[PDB]
Amino acid sequence: MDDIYKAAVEQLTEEQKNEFKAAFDIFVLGAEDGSISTKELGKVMRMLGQNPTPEELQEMIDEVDEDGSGTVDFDEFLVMMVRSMKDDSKGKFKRPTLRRVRISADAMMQALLGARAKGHHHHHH
Numbered sequence: 001m002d003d004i005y006k007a008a009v010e011q012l013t014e015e016q017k018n019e020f021k022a023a024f025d026i027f028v029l030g031a032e033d034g035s036i037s038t039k040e041l042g043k044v045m046r047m048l049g050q051n052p053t054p055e056e057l058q059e060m061i062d063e064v065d066e067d068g069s070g071t072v073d074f075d076e077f078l079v080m081m082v083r084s085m086k087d088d089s090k091g092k093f094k095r096p097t098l099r100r101v102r103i104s105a106d107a108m109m110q111a112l113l114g115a116r117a118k119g120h121h122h123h124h125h
Ligand SMILES: NCCCCCCCNS(=O)(=O)c1cccc2c(Cl)cccc12
Pocket: 036, 041, 044, 045, 059, 060, 061, 062, 063, 064, 072, 080, 083, 084, 087, 089, 101, 102, 103, 104, 105, 108
């Protein structure tokens, strides 16, 4: 993993970390290990309107999965959001060919939450 991405995770405030954490739980819905795999990835993408194949799903995870785990964990899913936002990739070129992902990770968060998530109520901080 990149040091910059790691800093981004730590940089995120309580709300930012909490928001991402919630996505992880939903993103890893049905995951035995709790990580986000192609099975969970495909389900999430399906909600967004995408229907990528298992092979494609694993590749996407590989983007944020440097440990070759094949699954996105808490630190990995957080980076994905950060990586998408920053996009340090700077487009390595390559034509649209039969591949091309421009999904908004930030937008995906809404799909993952799809709820006000007001279960917790705290006052008098
Ligand atoms: N300029 C291109 C920037 C892509 C940055 C890479 C993150 C986004 N890739 S993705 O296929 O849209 C995508 C969408 C939802 C979930 C994903 C997960 Cl859990 C893993 C990998 C990918 C995912």
